[PDB]
Each structure stands twice: as C-alpha cells, then as structure tokens.
Amino acid sequence: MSLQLLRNTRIFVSTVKTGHNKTNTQEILVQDDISWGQDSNSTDITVNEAGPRPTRGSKRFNDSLNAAEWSFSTYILPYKDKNTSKQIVPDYMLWHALSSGRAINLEGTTGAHNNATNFMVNFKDNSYHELAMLHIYILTDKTWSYIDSCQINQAEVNVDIEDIGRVTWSGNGNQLIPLDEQPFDPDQIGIDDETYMTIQGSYIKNKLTILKIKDMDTNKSYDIPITGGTFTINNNITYLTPNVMSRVTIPIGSFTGAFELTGSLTAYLNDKSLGSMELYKDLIKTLKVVNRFEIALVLGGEYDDERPAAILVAKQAHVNIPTIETDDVLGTSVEFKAIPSDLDAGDEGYLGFSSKYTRTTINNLIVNGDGATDAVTAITVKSAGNVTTLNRSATLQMSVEVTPSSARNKEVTWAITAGDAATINATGLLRADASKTGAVTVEATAKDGSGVKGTKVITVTAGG
C-alpha cells in the first residue's frame, strides 16, 4: 500500500544478470526527464458487409510487443578515482557500449579506455552487429525492475550556453521485466559521499565553449565564437521481432545500423579576420562536393590552470554549405558530419574527458589522439656545425631541435620549397652542384601532424 514517486528513482547499469559487484554495476545519476517503458501492438478484425442488417462487430488480438524504450540525461562529470588514480567518467560503461562491441577493458586502446591524464572514447572498434550489451536496472522507491539486454542507441549532447554540460542517452531493450526481489544492495553499489564530493568538484559549463575549426585543404584556422550547438553519436540500431499469429512475441536480437557522428553549430557573423563571415563566404564561393575540415569542439574551455573539459575531435569532417539565420543579430549555422577516411576504418572521431586539462594537454589530445602523449610545439632547424651558408658542390647535413623535449614523435621530414639550387634526401644530407647562384630554402615538418614549421634561408653563393 504505497504510491511511487519519480524523484526516488535510481538507475544502475550492468553487464551481468548475476554476480553484481562494483566493477559490473554502477549507479547513473539521472535527472527529471528520465523515462522508460514498453508498448504493445494489436489489431482489430472487422467484418465489412454491404447488405441490409449487416454485422457490426469487431475483435482485438494482441500480436506483438515493441522494443522497450528508455532515456535519461546525465551530467558530464569527469574525475579521478582514488582506487586506480585514472581519470574516469561515472557513466563509463555507457560510453563503452556506445563506442565498441567488445568486452570492456580500460587498460586497452579502443572504445572507452582511461589514463592517468584523461578518459578517452574512440570508435575504432565498433564494427559489430551487436555492441557491448548492458542491463539497465531501475529502482523506484521500493519495487525493482530492469530492462533485459539493452543497447545504447544514441547519445545526445546539447551545447546550450548558460547551462551545464549534459548528455542525453537513448536506447532499446528486449523486454522490461519487473523484479520482486532485490538484485543487489543499492546502498553499497550506489555512489558514496566521498566520490560525490569529488564529482561535484568538477563540472563542465557549456558557456565556456571554444571551437577549433581548420580547413585541411587550405590550412585556414577560423575564430568562431559559438552561440549554441549540438552533436550526436547515433547507431541507428533496429530491433527485430518475430511475427507469430498464435502467440505474442518480444524482440529477439538486434542489428546496428550506420554509425553517424553529426553536429550543428550556430554563431554570429563576424567581419573580423578569419571570422564567421570569412568561413561562410569561403564555403559558398568554393562550392565543393566534398570538404575536409578539422573540428575540435572543446566544452568547458581551455585554460593554463587545470579545468574540467569534454572534447569532441573530428579529424576529417564534412561541413555543409552554411546559411544565414536572420535574427535580431545576424548569424549562421555550421552543420557538420565526421566522416571516416575509409568506410571500414572507423576513426570518424574520438572524445577526451578529464578534470585536468591544461592547454597543452588538449592540444596534444587533438594532434596526437591522447592527452598523455606530448606533441611538438615549435622547431628551429639546425645545420651541421652552426653553418650559415654554402658554396657550390658542398654538402650540408642539417639537423633539428624540437620542443618539448618529451614529445613522442621527434622526427621530421625534409623538403625544398623556395629556389632550385640544392636537393635533400630522407636523412637530410643536402647536396648542391655548380651554377647555383641563388638563395634556396629548406623546410621540415613533424610526422605527428602537429603543424609545426622548421624554416631556414641558406645563402648559397657561387663560391670564392
């Protein structure tokens, strides 16, 4: 004899239906908009006669049950746990079941895997017809229930400024099953006060949102202050249910669709250099069937001191032709989609969550893929013995110095750009010949894709 209120609901995400412990189940902090259920299909058989005194009667049959629908919203709350000292988001298994179809392994390098610097999610291993399989456990007041064999259909993230960073999850399950007995003690599995304090120490505010967009075909970075946006991770999962005329049926298995990583970004038109107006004019002047943009949406902002942040990186993105949104202040919309280099390659994009992002950390996350792996920032090329010039028929094996000293990729390539008076090899052994009286240049760039420039103008002469 009791009424059940929605405010007392508690959600646990599990990968096992028995043997529930702290590594298989954790509570998911949900909000008011939580919803779940399961709909049923039916049919009416009616006789349609034409004569006088016709039969006017119907009949209903239950024929099938639809896939269970569930949805809830959670705050993006990166933090570091005391047990492992690795940055982790509380709803990490949700990210894993969204990202890959293999067993969860935070020590690995695919799907949801963490580190001493940041928590990372990449979609390099999502080529599966059935992604990682969860079981949502619902606790309303006293009664228990759960949805059997769920799959993460999508994860909506709305960049709504003057609001907190939040993600909305949606999915489907085979069947919603009400449980009379307690599966596991929610007091122990549920998050305790210490980790709650640690989490609430780190919040992501959508207002402090910087965006980094670069045209890979022209090497043009734009300065676009955002007004509002959203990006989605969608699986297009469809649940199959068998058709049996004699008995009602529930869905039996599913099949993932096409993985889509789209987005939409609204901003005001700026007349300044490399502003929104320049991007819009370039996009509507080129009129190209395909675009290669690098988009790095950085929720929570970038700062020298440690700040929480959630970052979406699209290496090779596709940007639609923008349109002007006539409001009281003129604006625009930059709708993009992260496409892979090859269809069966994955790597459409990745995400990095942490409560400790210095600007260098997010920079090397963007250019190297991991916040811990350092990346080169600047280069000044060095000759063989501090030499400033060269004469005809003389070698010059030039070297390189890089910063920082702990960058993972310390190598560079070699090229000649301005002038035709010398040639360089893979190692850097520049070679010249006679009849070389012009000023020639030499260049070097790193192999990690940082975008670092090494230049030197050597004054090659005809000799004494």
Binding site: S127, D344, A426
Partner: protein, 140 residues
C-alpha cells in the same frame, strides 16, 4: 588500341623467398596472324626499389635483386631473398584488416628496364608499378 596494365600489386609471403619472372615478347598484327618472337635481353638490366610512401623523402624499405634468366627466350626474373622479405615485414604498417589479418601494406614499388651502352641511347622505361603487400607467417 586496348589498354595496358602497368599497375600490378604484389603479395609476398613472410619467411619465404619471393620470385617473380617477366617475359618480354615482340608482337605484331598483320595479314599473317599474330607473330610473337621473344625479345633478346642483351644489355638489358632491371632495378627496383620499395618505399613506404609515394611522397618525396620516403624511407626506402628495401630494394629488389635483378637477374636475367634466358636472353634467347626473353625471360627476366625480378625477386628478393628471404632476408629482404623479413626486412620489409619489419617495416610494414602495423594496421591489420579484418577477414584476413595476414595482409599488411608494405609500400610502393617500381621497376625500370634500361639499356646502357656507348652506342645505346640513354633510355629508361618504367615497366610496372603498384603496391607491395605482406602475408605474415608464423613459422620461422
């Protein structure tokens, strides 16, 4: 009038010597039917190299050993020893492909046949081109 097929992709086997032989045959279409006579490979040498990329400054993975088997029958063999196969296997890309984890991309290769002599013109000719793949083996 038909097309040529200069682009050929080779697949080598790890821990096993790779041997490819090419036959050059003279052809003609006339009143009498197609007359074919083997091309006499005298002063004809081959030379092939493999790099991990097309772009300038690419690392040279290895180079092919060239030999002429039979000049009268116009047969030349282009191959590499097992040690070169291991060298290329070490330098191959680590990215695997599902449905066949064996094959990995090793790089690009070219073959030039040339005839160099005092009376001969300094003429080269890129007979083929393409990419080199590796079938990883476990034995040895």
């Amino acid at each position: 009038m038909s097309t040529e097929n200069r682009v050929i992709d080779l697949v080598v086997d790890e821990n096993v010597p790779y041997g490819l032989l090419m036959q050059f045959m003279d052809v003609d279409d006339s009143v009498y039917p197609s007359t074919s006579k083997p091309v006499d490979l005298t002063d004809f040498s081959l030379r092939g190299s493999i790099k991990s990329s097309l772009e300038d400054g690419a690392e040279t993975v290895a180079s092919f050993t060239t030999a002429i088997v039979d000049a009268a029958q116009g047969v030349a063999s282009i191959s590499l020893p097992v040690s070169a196969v291991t060298t290329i296997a070490s330098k191959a890309s680590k990215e695997r492909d599902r449905y066949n984890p064996r094959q990995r991309l090793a790089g690009y290769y070219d073959v030039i046949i040339t005839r160099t002599a005092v009376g001969s013109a300094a003429s080269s000719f890129r007979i083929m081109e393409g990419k080199v793949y590796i079938s990883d083996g476990v034995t040895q």
